[PDB]
Amino acid sequence: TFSYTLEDHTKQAFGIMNELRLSQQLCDVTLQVKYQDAPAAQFMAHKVVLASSSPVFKAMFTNGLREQGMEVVSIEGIHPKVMERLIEFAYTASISMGEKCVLHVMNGAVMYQIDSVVRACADFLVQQL
């Protein structure tokens, strides 16, 4: 038989998936993030991408129903900027923050079981010692 693999493929396809998110195309979930006194924010995304990067989103979205179109999800207890950075991680494989954001991002990463990000924020805080 003949077999071929493009190693860069998953990188490239996520690059296009991030473009479709920024263009709000093919999105099926709107995350409405309200945290304490911060202004409410909204993030549109694709459930299957969120599901691929967070076990908590996967279970949140996999239910027996064929949901029709655009589901709104109310998100509590995480700041808008943290959610934004986590969504960006799901779509880009990278995350960036100032040395004083690192703690709230781990909080959010623990809450959405983003294993990779938890391990990294823990390494950083320990190195600050």
Point out which residues bind a second copy (CB under 8 A).
1-7, 9-14, 16-17, 20, 25-26, 28, 46-49, 51-53, 58, 61-62, 66-70, 89-90, 93-99, 101-102, 116-117, 120, 124
- State which residue, 4 or 39, has the beta carbon closest to a second copy: 4
65 contacts 87 by C-beta, under 8 angstroms = no
Rank residues 9 and 36 by Cβ distance to a second copy and give the closer one. 9
Output the smallest distance, CB 111 to a second copy, in A: 18
CA 84 – CA 95 distance, rounded (Å)? 10
What SS3 class is residue 61?
A: helix
CB of 49 to a second copy, least distance (A): 7
Judged by beta carbon, residue 41 or residue 102, the one nearer a second copy is: 102
109: number of Cβ within 10 Å: 25
Nearest of 36, 19, 27, 120 to residue 81 by alpha carbon: 36
State which residue, 4 or 76, has the beta carbon closest to a second copy.
Answer: 4
Alpha-carbon gap, residue 28 to 87, rounded angstroms = 14
Closest approach, Cβ 37 to a second copy, in A, equals 25
Backbone angles phi, psi at 65, to 5 degrees: -80, 145
